Amino acid sequence: MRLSYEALEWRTPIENSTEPVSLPPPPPFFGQERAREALELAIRGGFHA
Amino acid sequence: MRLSYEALEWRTPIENSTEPVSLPPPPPFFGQERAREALELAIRGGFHAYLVGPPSLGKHEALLAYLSTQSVETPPDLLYVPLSERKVAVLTLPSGQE
Amino acid sequence: VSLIRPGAVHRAQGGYLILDALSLKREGTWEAFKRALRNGQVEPVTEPQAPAGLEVEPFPIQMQVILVGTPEAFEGLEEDPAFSELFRIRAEFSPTLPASPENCTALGGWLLAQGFQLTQGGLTRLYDEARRMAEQRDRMDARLVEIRALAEEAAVLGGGLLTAESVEQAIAAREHRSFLSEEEFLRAVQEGVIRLRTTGRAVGEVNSLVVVEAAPYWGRPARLTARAAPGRDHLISIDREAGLGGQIFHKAVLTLAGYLRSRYIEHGSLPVTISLAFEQNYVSIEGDSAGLAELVAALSAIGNLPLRQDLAVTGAVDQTGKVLAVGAINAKVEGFFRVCKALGLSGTQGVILPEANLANLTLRAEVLEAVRAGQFHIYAVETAEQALEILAGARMEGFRGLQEKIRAGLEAFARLEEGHDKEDRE
Amino acid sequence: GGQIFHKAVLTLAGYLRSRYIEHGSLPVTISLAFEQNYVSIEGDSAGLAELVAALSAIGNLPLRQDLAVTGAVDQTGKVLAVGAINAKVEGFFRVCKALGLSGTQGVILPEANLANLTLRAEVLEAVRAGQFHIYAVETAEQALEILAGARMEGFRGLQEKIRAGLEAFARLEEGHDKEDRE
Amino acid sequence: APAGLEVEPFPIQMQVILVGTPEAFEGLEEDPAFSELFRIRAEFSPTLP
């Protein structure tokens, strides 16, 4: 099938590229819940991770 | 054949998971009668033994625990005594005399 | 004289000296220690830059050396005959203990001596996980320190008390912390990057089960395609011919070739060329566990039998046509269950595995619950004919049977080849 | 030839052997060559390209040179996903733009790589303008239909042409045998 | 040095957290003493959703 431009347009659209952003810092290991949970377990247990 | 759940249920059933247990410590090399008998033979005969087995079996600690319960005759007191300012020899004394 | 610092042979005089043979071999001290034991005497080591040192009498060796180490460190050390001359008593540790209530009680007592707070359910779960690690229903893993490590992790998650829930949480966390590779594989399967079908029927396609050798505990399906073409008696293993073939894995392919050659004899050499491919694998296949899957795929390709894609197939098979036991059966069954659950359980997915692995089926809680609910099936077979019957959903015997269809397909391929020869001549 | 690349060729051989059975062993010898390459080929991404080239050579089907072909294919005949799809698509777009876009150049790639198509801005603009096409296929038959510009089904179809070419080659071989005997 | 000091070994009251690419760890975890000491594995997903 011939893919249309809409089916190939992957970029998230921009509407105001001149507006500065002000966002709070993300938590450490954001998007890495596996590593964060493993480190939490290692910290509670005093294990070597 | 289509295995039923009963034929696949391998876990030993639990009935009271909130009841604390109080069990006596097992003998050293429990379930390892071969190694225990070999070590017994090595101890009686004064032979040099060697423990073999897959890593993480707890061989090093069970060995120390088993040897601690053993009782060898009082070893003679061995000490270095200088026969001169340049020559030092080994002296063997009855235990508790050094 | 007062500057002589005592060593191990001095502190262990009249008793026992426990040494690690890996350490003795690693630091080159083995030869010096071997000479000391044979001499029965040794002197404390003196720095060679000293002018003359003391005329120190060699210290007598009145101890019993007990070298402890993995077998590899000892077959790497006993090749020297002086070792077997000096260390003659071999205390060998069985890697597994017989799973019995007495050994469960012994494990509980050992853990209590280690300082844990056990409950009956927690001890039972730990004992079951020991049997899990032993991969046998009637044997528990003797690796007590591994059980102690799991107990420590359960204590941390259980607040110091080893309840059944705490041990289950510890095991789940252990699985999850090393689940990244399986998570990526499941994501790829769902995205369609790795095309796997767990529903419907396909001809010559079967969901073989492999074990990721990068971490030899995660099993995952790898669909296997067999294509039958008339001509040479060759059974082409596309995987092996293109490298990607274990030394044992080559034996499985030859064994299947022999079984197919000897089983179907109504012509001369088997008139079909079967190409077997672990497709989208891109990695070495080492075991012979594919034997049953390859055999059923080849038989379906020969007979144009649409195999059920619901069922994964694992198990080695000899040229007699009988399914033999395989290792890591739990890993493969649970991996196929993971893939089926990710794509959505349909109530008919399952795994075909040898009867010889019944004692090795220590499945996870979720797999057992699915089996009990009827959302997952486990089929135990002893001959490849049984596995093909389960897959294609028909019996070998009788008219319109699977064996008759296979024979008809073989006749068709032989007719194609002989017609090629006939129009070759005329 | 990569260790994996060997598997792609054997998979194509198996697909061709099992798919076209009106004679005995497939009566054709297909020689596949990456001309002017002079360097090792490691992936199996060439599987679809090799398959369609072999099918065209068998059936004397003139494939469109406008379209590049990427994608692995199994012996079932179904196109499988490949890695670095963006790099290949954009490289072919670069080559087409260097030689001048004609409004029909494009790339045939597996449907399994739809989630992996994060193309550059220029390629997306060309696709939107109609100067570049992206074809997503799931079976090698679809790729051959797109390349040769005809359907396999029906009379004068691609499948019929492939069968006719196979018959011609088989006739050449059996004639060689026939005058060899007499 | 002639004899040094009779220094008592310093206790280890810390938690070691070894950080590295997987290659450096499958090149390091082949020794069973590693998995005995470092048991908690905090693994980082190479991609976030």
PDB file of N, CA and C in Angstrom, chain B residues 33-42 47-54, chain C residues 66-67 69-75 78 83-84 86-93:
ATOM      1  N   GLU B  33      25.326 -36.250  53.019  1.00  0.00           N
ATOM      2  CA  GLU B  33      25.959 -37.333  53.762  1.00  0.00           C
ATOM      3  C   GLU B  33      27.253 -37.796  53.108  1.00  0.00           C
ATOM      4  N   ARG B  34      27.360 -37.689  51.784  1.00  0.00           N
ATOM      5  CA  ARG B  34      28.595 -38.082  51.115  1.00  0.00           C
ATOM      6  C   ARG B  34      29.764 -37.222  51.576  1.00  0.00           C
ATOM      7  N   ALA B  35      29.600 -35.900  51.519  1.00  0.00           N
ATOM      8  CA  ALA B  35      30.669 -35.000  51.936  1.00  0.00           C
ATOM      9  C   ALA B  35      30.956 -35.136  53.423  1.00  0.00           C
ATOM     10  N   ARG B  36      29.914 -35.295  54.239  1.00  0.00           N
ATOM     11  CA  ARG B  36      30.125 -35.438  55.674  1.00  0.00           C
ATOM     12  C   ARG B  36      30.896 -36.711  55.995  1.00  0.00           C
ATOM     13  N   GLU B  37      30.555 -37.823  55.341  1.00  0.00           N
ATOM     14  CA  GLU B  37      31.282 -39.067  55.572  1.00  0.00           C
ATOM     15  C   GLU B  37      32.719 -38.966  55.081  1.00  0.00           C
ATOM     16  N   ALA B  38      32.933 -38.317  53.935  1.00  0.00           N
ATOM     17  CA  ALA B  38      34.295 -38.135  53.447  1.00  0.00           C
ATOM     18  C   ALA B  38      35.118 -37.308  54.422  1.00  0.00           C
ATOM     19  N   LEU B  39      34.533 -36.237  54.957  1.00  0.00           N
ATOM     20  CA  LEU B  39      35.248 -35.416  55.926  1.00  0.00           C
ATOM     21  C   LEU B  39      35.499 -36.178  57.217  1.00  0.00           C
ATOM     22  N   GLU B  40      34.548 -37.014  57.637  1.00  0.00           N
ATOM     23  CA  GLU B  40      34.769 -37.844  58.813  1.00  0.00           C
ATOM     24  C   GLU B  40      35.948 -38.781  58.600  1.00  0.00           C
ATOM     25  N   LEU B  41      36.013 -39.418  57.431  1.00  0.00           N
ATOM     26  CA  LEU B  41      37.133 -40.303  57.133  1.00  0.00           C
ATOM     27  C   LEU B  41      38.446 -39.534  57.113  1.00  0.00           C
ATOM     28  N   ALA B  42      38.447 -38.346  56.510  1.00  0.00           N
ATOM     29  CA  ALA B  42      39.658 -37.537  56.476  1.00  0.00           C
ATOM     30  C   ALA B  42      40.093 -37.103  57.865  1.00  0.00           C
ATOM     31  N   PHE B  47      44.039 -37.405  56.932  1.00  0.00           N
ATOM     32  CA  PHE B  47      44.322 -37.164  55.530  1.00  0.00           C
ATOM     33  C   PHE B  47      44.026 -35.716  55.164  1.00  0.00           C
ATOM     34  N   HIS B  48      44.558 -35.301  54.022  1.00  0.00           N
ATOM     35  CA  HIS B  48      44.224 -34.011  53.441  1.00  0.00           C
ATOM     36  C   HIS B  48      43.044 -34.206  52.501  1.00  0.00           C
ATOM     37  N   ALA B  49      41.930 -33.557  52.807  1.00  0.00           N
ATOM     38  CA  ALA B  49      40.725 -33.660  52.004  1.00  0.00           C
ATOM     39  C   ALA B  49      40.567 -32.415  51.147  1.00  0.00           C
ATOM     40  N   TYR B  50      39.589 -32.461  50.249  1.00  0.00           N
ATOM     41  CA  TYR B  50      39.242 -31.289  49.461  1.00  0.00           C
ATOM     42  C   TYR B  50      37.754 -31.320  49.159  1.00  0.00           C
ATOM     43  N   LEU B  51      37.086 -30.197  49.399  1.00  0.00           N
ATOM     44  CA  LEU B  51      35.647 -30.088  49.209  1.00  0.00           C
ATOM     45  C   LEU B  51      35.363 -29.572  47.806  1.00  0.00           C
ATOM     46  N   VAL B  52      34.563 -30.315  47.054  1.00  0.00           N
ATOM     47  CA  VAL B  52      34.172 -29.918  45.710  1.00  0.00           C
ATOM     48  C   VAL B  52      32.659 -29.791  45.664  1.00  0.00           C
ATOM     49  N   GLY B  53      32.180 -28.886  44.817  1.00  0.00           N
ATOM     50  CA  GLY B  53      30.725 -28.713  44.679  1.00  0.00           C
ATOM     51  C   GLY B  53      30.399 -27.411  43.990  1.00  0.00           C
ATOM     52  N   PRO B  54      29.199 -27.275  43.397  1.00  0.00           N
ATOM     53  CA  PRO B  54      28.832 -26.063  42.685  1.00  0.00           C
ATOM     54  C   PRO B  54      28.945 -24.857  43.621  1.00  0.00           C
TER      55      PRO B  54
ATOM     56  N   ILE C  66      42.336 -28.666  53.987  1.00  0.00           N
ATOM     57  CA  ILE C  66      41.030 -28.993  53.420  1.00  0.00           C
ATOM     58  C   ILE C  66      40.754 -27.950  52.341  1.00  0.00           C
ATOM     59  N   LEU C  67      41.107 -28.263  51.092  1.00  0.00           N
ATOM     60  CA  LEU C  67      40.930 -27.262  50.009  1.00  0.00           C
ATOM     61  C   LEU C  67      39.465 -27.265  49.583  1.00  0.00           C
ATOM     62  N   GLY C  69      36.564 -25.756  46.836  1.00  0.00           N
ATOM     63  CA  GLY C  69      36.388 -25.020  45.574  1.00  0.00           C
ATOM     64  C   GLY C  69      35.460 -25.712  44.601  1.00  0.00           C
ATOM     65  N   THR C  70      34.975 -24.981  43.599  1.00  0.00           N
ATOM     66  CA  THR C  70      34.129 -25.543  42.564  1.00  0.00           C
ATOM     67  C   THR C  70      34.893 -26.635  41.819  1.00  0.00           C
ATOM     68  N   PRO C  71      34.191 -27.610  41.235  1.00  0.00           N
ATOM     69  CA  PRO C  71      34.905 -28.674  40.513  1.00  0.00           C
ATOM     70  C   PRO C  71      35.829 -28.155  39.432  1.00  0.00           C
ATOM     71  N   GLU C  72      35.427 -27.120  38.694  1.00  0.00           N
ATOM     72  CA  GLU C  72      36.287 -26.590  37.641  1.00  0.00           C
ATOM     73  C   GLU C  72      37.663 -26.227  38.176  1.00  0.00           C
ATOM     74  N   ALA C  73      37.719 -25.589  39.345  1.00  0.00           N
ATOM     75  CA  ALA C  73      38.990 -25.235  39.959  1.00  0.00           C
ATOM     76  C   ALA C  73      39.800 -26.448  40.389  1.00  0.00           C
ATOM     77  N   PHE C  74      39.194 -27.632  40.443  1.00  0.00           N
ATOM     78  CA  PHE C  74      39.894 -28.831  40.890  1.00  0.00           C
ATOM     79  C   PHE C  74      40.304 -29.754  39.753  1.00  0.00           C
ATOM     80  N   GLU C  75      39.431 -29.989  38.768  1.00  0.00           N
ATOM     81  CA  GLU C  75      39.906 -30.608  37.534  1.00  0.00           C
ATOM     82  C   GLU C  75      40.913 -29.715  36.824  1.00  0.00           C
ATOM     83  N   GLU C  78      43.800 -30.910  39.680  1.00  0.00           N
ATOM     84  CA  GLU C  78      44.156 -32.290  39.973  1.00  0.00           C
ATOM     85  C   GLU C  78      44.878 -32.969  38.820  1.00  0.00           C
ATOM     86  N   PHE C  83      48.945 -33.642  43.446  1.00  0.00           N
ATOM     87  CA  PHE C  83      47.696 -33.302  44.115  1.00  0.00           C
ATOM     88  C   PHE C  83      46.968 -34.560  44.567  1.00  0.00           C
ATOM     89  N   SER C  84      46.754 -35.497  43.648  1.00  0.00           N
ATOM     90  CA  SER C  84      45.948 -36.673  44.056  1.00  0.00           C
ATOM     91  C   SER C  84      46.768 -37.495  45.046  1.00  0.00           C
ATOM     92  N   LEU C  86      48.563 -36.137  47.494  1.00  0.00           N
ATOM     93  CA  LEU C  86      48.447 -35.456  48.813  1.00  0.00           C
ATOM     94  C   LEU C  86      46.978 -35.365  49.235  1.00  0.00           C
ATOM     95  N   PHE C  87      46.111 -34.835  48.370  1.00  0.00           N
ATOM     96  CA  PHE C  87      44.692 -34.724  48.695  1.00  0.00           C
ATOM     97  C   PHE C  87      43.978 -35.929  48.101  1.00  0.00           C
ATOM     98  N   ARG C  88      43.712 -36.928  48.937  1.00  0.00           N
ATOM     99  CA  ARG C  88      43.133 -38.178  48.469  1.00  0.00           C
ATOM    100  C   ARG C  88      41.665 -38.338  48.824  1.00  0.00           C
ATOM    101  N   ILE C  89      41.209 -37.720  49.903  1.00  0.00           N
ATOM    102  CA  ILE C  89      39.808 -37.782  50.292  1.00  0.00           C
ATOM    103  C   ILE C  89      39.056 -36.671  49.577  1.00  0.00           C
ATOM    104  N   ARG C  90      38.008 -37.040  48.852  1.00  0.00           N
ATOM    105  CA  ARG C  90      37.198 -36.094  48.098  1.00  0.00           C
ATOM    106  C   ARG C  90      35.827 -35.998  48.751  1.00  0.00           C
ATOM    107  N   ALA C  91      35.540 -34.851  49.354  1.00  0.00           N
ATOM    108  CA  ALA C  91      34.231 -34.576  49.938  1.00  0.00           C
ATOM    109  C   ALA C  91      33.440 -33.780  48.910  1.00  0.00           C
ATOM    110  N   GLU C  92      32.561 -34.460  48.185  1.00  0.00           N
ATOM    111  CA  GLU C  92      31.832 -33.832  47.096  1.00  0.00           C
ATOM    112  C   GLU C  92      30.418 -33.483  47.530  1.00  0.00           C
ATOM    113  N   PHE C  93      29.984 -32.284  47.164  1.00  0.00           N
ATOM    114  CA  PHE C  93      28.689 -31.756  47.564  1.00  0.00           C
ATOM    115  C   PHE C  93      27.694 -31.968  46.433  1.00  0.00           C
TER     116      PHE C  93
END
